[PDB]
Amino acid sequence: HTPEEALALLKRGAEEIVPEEELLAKLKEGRPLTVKLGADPTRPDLHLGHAVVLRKMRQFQELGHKVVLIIGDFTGMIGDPSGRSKTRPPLTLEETRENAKTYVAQAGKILRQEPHLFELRYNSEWLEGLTFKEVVRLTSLMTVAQMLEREDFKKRYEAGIPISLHELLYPFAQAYDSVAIRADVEMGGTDQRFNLLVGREVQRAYGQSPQVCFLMPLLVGLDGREKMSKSLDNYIGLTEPPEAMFKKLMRVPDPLLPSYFRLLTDLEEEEIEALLKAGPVPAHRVLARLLTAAYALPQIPPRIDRAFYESLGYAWEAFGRDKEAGPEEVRRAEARYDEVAKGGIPEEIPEVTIPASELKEGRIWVARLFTLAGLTPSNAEARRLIQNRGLRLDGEVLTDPMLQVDLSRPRILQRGKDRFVRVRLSD
Amino acid sequence: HTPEEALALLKRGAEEIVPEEELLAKLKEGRPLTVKLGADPTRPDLHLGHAVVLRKMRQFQELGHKVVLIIGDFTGMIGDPSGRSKTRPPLTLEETRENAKTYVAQAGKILRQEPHLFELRYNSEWLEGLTFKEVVRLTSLMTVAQMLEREDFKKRYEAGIPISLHELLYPFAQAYDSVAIRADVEMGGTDQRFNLLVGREVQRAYGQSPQVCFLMPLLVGLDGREKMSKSLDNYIGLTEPPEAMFKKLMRVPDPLLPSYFRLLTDLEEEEIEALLKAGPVPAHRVLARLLTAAYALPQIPPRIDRAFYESLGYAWEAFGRDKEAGPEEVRRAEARYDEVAKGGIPEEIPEVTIPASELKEGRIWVARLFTLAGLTPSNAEARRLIQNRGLRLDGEVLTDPMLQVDLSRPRILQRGKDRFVRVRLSD
RNA sequence: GGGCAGGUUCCCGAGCGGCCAAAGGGGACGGUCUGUAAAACCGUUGGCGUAUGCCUUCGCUGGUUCGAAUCCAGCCCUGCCCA
RNA sequence: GGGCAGGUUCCCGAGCGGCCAAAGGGGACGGUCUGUAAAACCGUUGGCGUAUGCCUUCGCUGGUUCGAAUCCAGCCCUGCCCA
Numbered sequence A, B: 001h002t003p004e005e006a007l008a009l010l011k012r013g014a015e016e017i018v019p020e021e022e023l024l025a026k027l028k029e030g031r032p033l034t035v036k037l038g039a040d041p042t043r044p045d046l047h048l049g050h051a052v053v054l055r056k057m058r059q060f061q062e063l064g065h066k067v068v069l070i071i072g073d074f075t076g077m078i079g080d081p082s083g084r085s086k087t088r089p090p091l092t093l094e095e096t097r098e099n100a101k102t103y104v105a106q107a108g109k110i111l112r113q114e115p116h117l118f119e120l121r122y123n124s125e126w127l128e129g130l131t132f133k134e135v136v137r138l139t140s141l142m143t144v145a146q147m148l149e150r151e152d153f154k155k156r157y158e159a160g161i162p163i164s165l166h167e168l169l170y171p172f173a174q175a176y177d178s179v180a181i182r183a184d185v186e187m188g189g190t191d192q193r194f195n196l197l198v199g200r201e202v203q204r205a206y207g208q209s210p211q212v213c214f215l216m217p218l219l220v221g222l223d224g225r226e227k228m229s230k231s232l233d234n235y236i237g238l239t240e241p242p243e244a245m246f247k248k249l250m251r252v253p254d255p256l257l258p259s260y261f262r263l264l265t266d267l268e269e270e271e272i273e274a275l276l277k278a279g280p281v282p283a284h285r286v287l288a289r290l291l292t293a294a295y296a297l298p299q300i301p302p303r304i305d306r307a308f309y310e311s312l313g314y315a316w317e318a319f320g321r322d323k324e325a326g327p328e329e330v331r332r333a334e335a336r337y338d339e340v341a342k343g344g345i346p347e348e349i350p351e352v353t354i355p356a357s358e359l360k361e362g363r364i365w366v367a368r369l370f371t372l373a374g375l376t377p378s379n380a381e382a383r384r385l386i387q388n389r390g391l392r393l394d395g396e397v398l399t400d401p402m403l404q405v406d407l408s409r410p411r412i413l414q415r416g417k418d419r420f421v422r423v424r425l426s427d
Numbered sequence C, D: 001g002g003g004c005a006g007g008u009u010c011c012c013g014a015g016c017g018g019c020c021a022a023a024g025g026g027g028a029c030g031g032u033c034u035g036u037a038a039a040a041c042c043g044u045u046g047g048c049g050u051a052u053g054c055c056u057u058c059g060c061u062g063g064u065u066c067g068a069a070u071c072c073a074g075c076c077c078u079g080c081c082c083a
C-alpha cells in the first residue's frame, strides 16, 4: 500500500489524527516510522480497552512501521491525572515494576515481537536521572493558565477539589519519553489528547519533528457508562479464560455492541448492521465468539473479520444460531454460558479441599464454609447473602443461615448466578 | 542576655516573627541556632536594602548564633517570582556564579566571618543533583489552589498575565535549602513570607523542626515608591565611594527618613523624632553621615547609634550644623555635596585621556566628546541634552551643539547636576 | 490540535498604504523653582561629522507593490473559548 | 503564619451526649422479571460458632464524664478569605 493508501487503512476506526497532513507526509518518507504507546502499570493485566490502541499499533507494524512500547514504571509512580477527578494515589517504583511483568507478557497477544517492528522500554531508564535543572526547562515550556485550561483540572479547580502540584509534572514526564525516543507518532485513547499535545510542544523545544498525535475512541466498560479501566472493575481481561471472556462479552450492555464491533472487530459497517438485525442476544453470541476465539490464540490474527469468524467454522448466515460449530474451547465456553443460564452446573468447576480440622463436631457451618471457600468475604456476609436467597448448596437454594453442612461427600457451593466451587474433605 | 532577653533585642525593628513562641523556645536551648539567609545573585553588588536583613543577621551572630549565607546560584538561575509581575528572565549558572563573587566579598561589610558564626554555601551544591523523583515529592507537598493563593500569582492569573509553570518550582528549591542545612530560622524581607512558609512545610515533610520565619520590613528605594532593588536602579550600593553614598542618602525622599533610621540605624525613636525636628535637610546630613561613615569602614560597627555618631566627632546637639567635624573621608564627601549644590566643581574629578587621532581638523565636536567621555550614550543624545541646556563646558552651559572643542589644555565636561569628567590630549 | 482577540519603540500602548523613527500615557533623562528632595511646569525619549543619504527598530521567514509597521503566505508565542 | 467552613463507613454525606456499626443518596452485591442485558421493584451494604460479650471504623494524640462519632486540649490535612 502506497502512502496515500496507508493513511486510509490507519485512519479507519480512528477518533482523530492531528495534524493529519503530517502523517500522510511521514508515510511518504518510505522509512519505518516510530509509533509510540505507553502504559502505566498501576495495576496488572491489560484489557479489551487497551486492545483498542494496541490492535491499531499492530496495524502500524503490519504496514512495516516500528512500534516502541513504553512501560511507564516511572510515570506510573507519579500517576497520570488525565480523567481522574482526584489525585491518584502514590505507587512505589518497585510496585509498578512488578505489574509491568504482566504488561510485557500480555502486549504480545496483540503486538508483533519481531525486533525490527517492536522495541520495549521502561521510561525509568531515562527519567530517574532527569536533573532538577532539566525539569525546570520542561516545566518552563508551558503556563499555568494552560495547565488549568484542561477539562480535568479546570473542573477540579473550580469545584474546589485539591490538585497536588506534582500532578502537573506528569504531562512533561510523558512528553519527554517522546524526545527520549524521537517518536514520529504517539498512539492513545482520547483521554490523552493533552498529554499527546504537550508531547509535540516538548519535542519542538528539543528540536525534533513534532510527533503525530493519534487518538483512538475510548471503549466503555461493562457498567455501561464509564470507560473500561483496571481501577473501575468493568473490564474484560485480555488473558481471562475463554469461559470468562465469553460470559463477560455476553454481558456487554446492548447500547454498546456497535462500539464493540467497531473498536474490537474488523467487520464492515454493513456486517455489523445486519448482525444487530438478528437482535441483541444473537449479536452477543457473535461478538463473544469472535473475541473469545481470537484472544484464545497466542496472538490474535491480523484481522478479526467475517472471514476469520467463518474460518472458525461458523456460518455468518447462521447469525449465531450455529452454536455447535466452532473450536473445542470456544464451544465449551458458550456451552457453559448456556448451562448456567438454564440454572445448571458448569461441567468443570473449581474444587477446593477442606482440612478436616476446619470441621467442628463433624460438620461445618454453611456461613463459614462459603468463606473458607472464597465465595464470601465473611460469615456475616454469607449469612446476609443467604437471608437474601443468594447461595445454593448442591443446587438447592440455602435458607438456613445456621445450617451445618456435612462434608462427608463433595458438595457444590454456589454464590449468585455464576460462581461455583466444589469442596471436599482433605486432611 | 538570657533567652527572654534576646527575643527582645531581636524582635526590635522586625516586621514579624512567626511563630514567635518557637523562637523564644529555641533561644532557651542554649545552643547556637542556625540562621538562614539566601540571596540570588541575579545582578552583582548588595545594597542598603539587603543591609536591612543583614544587619539583623549580624545581630544574631552578636548573640552567639551561627549564620549560614546561602548564595542562590542555582535558584538565581530559575528566578524568584515573589513580587515580580512578569516571569523573571533566564540566567545561566555561570552567570549567577560570576555575580556571587561580589556578594561574598560584600556581605562581610555587615556580617561576622568567624567560622563558628558564619558559613558560606552555594545551593547549587545540593540542588543540581536533586532528582526528578525527588522533585515530584517536593511539589506534591502543596496544591495548585495554594500556589495561586499568592498575591503575586493571583493577580497575574486573574489579570491574564502569563505564568511559566517553572515559576512554581522556585518555592520548593528555596524550601529545600532549609532541609539541606537544618535551618532553625530563615531571615527575610516581607516579600518572602510565602517562600519562608513553604520552607516550614517542606521541613516537616523531611521530619525537621519547622524553622522560624523572620520577616524584616522592606526598605523603599530612592524613587520613593518601589522597594530598593538591583533591577530598579533605585539603590545605594553597600560599596559605593563615600562621595556617592553620601549624595544618594542626601536624596532619600523626605517621607522615608523615618524608615531609613529605623531600618538602617540604631537610634531610639526619641532621637529620630528630635532629628526630624531640625527639619529635612539637617536629618539627611545626619543620616548620610552615619551610614557613609559606617559603610566606609571594612565592617560596620555592632551598632549605628548616637554614640557611634558622636565617636565620629559630631555633636548630636549640633544636629548636622557641625559640618567641619567628622572623618577626613566623610568630611570631603559632605564637602563635595555642598560645592556641587553651589554649582562649583568637585575637587577630585575623573580624568579621561583622549587619543589625538580622535581629533579632527585639530578640534573635536562637543557632541562626540561627551560620548568619547562616557557622559552621553551618543552624539544625538548629547546634542539633545545640549538643546535642553544640560551639558557644561568648563563651567559654561553649552548652547552650540555644533561646537568644536579645543583639547589644547584640559577641559571639564559636565552632564546634569553632578557628573564630571576632566579630559585631555593623550596620544 | 481547533476558533477568536493580541504581539509595535525602556514599559503599556495608536497605527492608517506614502503624512512613520511611529500618537498618547508611564518611567526615565535635561531644565525652571528648590533643599543636589517633593509638587508643579517646560522640554527629551533610534544611530551616523554634523546629513532632500544609509542603517537599526514594529514576533520570525518569505512575498505583493515603485513604496510594507499597515497587505498576502507559512511559521512562532500569549489570553480567552474550546478539544 | 492568621480567620472562617470542612475531615464520618466503598464514595458523597446526617450526626444529636446514651436512641450509633452511624440517616439518606450513589455504587456495588443478592433477588424478582428477563436475554446470565437494560429498566423497574424488593433486600444487603463492620467482624467473631452463631453472641443482654468483645474488637475494628468516625483525620491524629491525649483528656472530661459512668458513657465521646458528639465535649475539651494540642497537632495534622483540605477549600475560601487573608498575609
Ligand SMILES: Nc1ncnc2c1ncn2[C@@H]1O[C@H](COP(=O)(O)OP(=O)(O)OP(=O)(O)O)[C@@H](O)[C@H]1O
Pocket: A038, A039, A040, A041, A048, A049, A050, A052, A053, A187, A188, A189, A190, A192, A216, A217, A218, A219, A220, A227, A228, A229, A230, A231
Ligand atoms: N477503555 C479504554 N479504551 C480505549 N483505550 C484505552 C482504554 N483504557 C486505556 N486505553 C489506552 O491505553 C493506554 C494505556 O492506558 P494506561 O493503562 O496507561 O492508563 P489508564 O487510562 O489509567 O488505564 P485504565 O483505563 O486501565 O485506567 C492509554 O493511553 C489509552 O490510550
Ligand SMILES: Nc1ncnc2c1ncn2[C@@H]1O[C@H](COP(=O)(O)OP(=O)(O)OP(=O)(O)O)[C@@H](O)[C@H]1O
Pocket: B038, B039, B040, B041, B048, B049, B050, B052, B053, B187, B188, B189, B190, B192, B216, B217, B218, B219, B220, B227, B228, B229, B230, B231
Ligand atoms: N529593599 C529591600 N529591603 C529589605 N530587604 C530586602 C530588600 N531587597 C532585598 N531584601 C532582602 O534580601 C534578601 C535577598 O534578596 P535578593 O537579592 O536575593 O532578591 P531580590 O528581592 O530580587 O533583591 P532586589 O531587591 O535587589 O531585587 C531578600 O530575601 C530579602 O529578605
Ligand SMILES: N[C@H](CO)Cc1ccc(O)cc1
Pocket: A037, A038, A039, A040, A070, A071, A072, A075, A080, A123, A173, A174, A175, A177, A178, A192, A195
Ligand atoms: N500516561 C499514559 C496513560 O497512563 C501512558 C503513557 C504514555 C506515554 C508515555 O511516554 C508513558 C506512559
Ligand SMILES: N[C@H](CO)Cc1ccc(O)cc1
Pocket: B037, B038, B039, B040, B070, B071, B072, B075, B080, B123, B173, B174, B175, B177, B178, B192, B195
Ligand atoms: N529567594 C530569595 C530571594 O531572592 C533568596 C533565597 C532565600 C533562601 C534560599 O535558600 C535561597 C535564596
